[PDB]
Design a protein around this ligand. Sequence first.
Ligand code: NI
Ligand code: NI
Lengths: 79, 79
Amino acid sequence: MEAVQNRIVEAAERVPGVRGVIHLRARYVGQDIWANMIIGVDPENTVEQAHEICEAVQAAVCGKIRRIESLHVSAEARE
Amino acid sequence: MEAVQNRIVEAAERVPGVRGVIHLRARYVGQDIWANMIIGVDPENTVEQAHEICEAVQAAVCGKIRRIESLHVSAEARE
Ligand code: NI
Ligand code: NI
């Protein structure tokens, strides 16, 4: 698990607009990972931008870590 | 194992100068991976360049796939 978590964080931090991973909760459902995470974003991004960054994160992380079968990503202002 | 192999190939293909992964043999030594691989390179690169590309591959792949504890990388001309 720690290895997979590190990969998740690393992958999310490489997406344009991510200001760190604020929270990540991952669990195994069998051999699959289900995860929920919160990213920081620029407070001055629009809500639509923040939604776009979240969807980019989801795409990036799921594309890199094939065992993830469910990933929810939300955003919070971070300075 | 197949998952780790895919990661190895993907990581090697992203290094400047790699013209595919020609061969990859990976084995588990306990929970660690030991691997030997051959990359393609431009026939017109110098032997020194090809050595540099191999060392870049080793660095890239070991940095991405933490379970690898031994990785030998050689090069062959590829068109
Ligand atoms: Ni949308
Ligand atoms: Ni040297």
